Amino acid sequence: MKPPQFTWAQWFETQHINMTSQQCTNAMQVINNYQRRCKNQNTFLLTTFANVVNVCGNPNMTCPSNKTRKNCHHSGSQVPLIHCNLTTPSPQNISNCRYAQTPANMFYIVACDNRDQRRDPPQYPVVPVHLDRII
Ligand SMILES: Nc1ncnc2c1ncn2[C@@H]1O[C@H](COP(=O)(O)OP(=O)(O)OP(=O)(O)OP(=O)(O)OP(=O)(O)OC[C@H]2O[C@@H](n3cnc4c(N)ncnc43)[C@H](O)[C@@H]2O)[C@@H](O)[C@H]1O
Structure with missing residues (x-):
């Protein structure tokens, strides 16, 4: 879930682009401290935010995770990624x-939307908001 100081695009960047350590245990502390729980799994794409914004310009497709949404876009090329999986759940001490x-x-495959009018920078009118699938 999203903490209130984030737009959807900023939250996408925080969860899926800004891997603050190459070690998952360390990188996941950021996400988990913001969500107040240990997220069970998470992908970090080793690409740039601008590269993802450009994927939002690729043809629209149906999102595989929800057949009623048509705001998804395929990356076209493969990228390196790191997928993090929770091995040890610490309920009462997320660190x-x-x-x-x-x-x-x-x-x-990413879902993209119009930016948050009040809070997202006008530089990018269209932004990634959800990581639908890795293939
Ligand atoms: N087998 C597997 N292999 C690899 N990866 C796997 C996997 N199984 C699960 N995953 C991924 O692991 C993560 C954890 O899943 P899970 O462990 O199932 O839990 P979750 O954290 O409660 O769920 P979220 O969907 O909220 O996850 P998220 O914050 O990562 O969502 P996202 O950034 O994509 O999206 C942000 C928010 O966008 C919103 N949203 C969904 N669809 C759209 C859409 N078309 N357009 C705009 N917003 C949308 C939702 O509110 C969503 O919370 C999810 O990304 C999942 O996709």
Whole structure:
């Protein structure tokens, strides 16, 4: 879920682009401290935010995770990524959660929307908001 100081695009960047350590246990502390729980799994794409914005310009397709949405876009090329999986869940001390890390080279599908009018920078009228699938 999204903390209130984020737009959807800023939250996408925080969860899926800004991997603050190459180790999942460390990188996941940021997400988990913002969500107040240990997220069970999460992908970080080793690409730039601008590259994702350009994927939002690729043809629209149906989102595989929800057949009623048509705001998804295929990456066209594969990228390197790291997928983090929770190995150790620490209910009453989220900083003690630990993760496994899996490196891969995969395509991705992102949902994009119009930016948040009040809070997102006008530089990018169209922004990624959800990571629908890795393939
Ligand atoms: N087998 C597997 N292999 C690899 N990865 C796997 C996997 N199984 C699960 N995953 C991924 O693991 C993560 C954890 O899933 P899960 O463990 O199932 O839990 P979750 O954290 O409660 O769920 P969220 O959907 O809210 O996850 P998120 O914050 O990552 O969502 P996202 O940034 O994409 O989206 C942000 C928000 O966008 C919103 N949204 C969904 N669809 C659209 C859409 N078309 N357009 C705009 N917003 C949309 C929702 O509110 C969503 O919360 C989810 O990304 C999932 O996709």
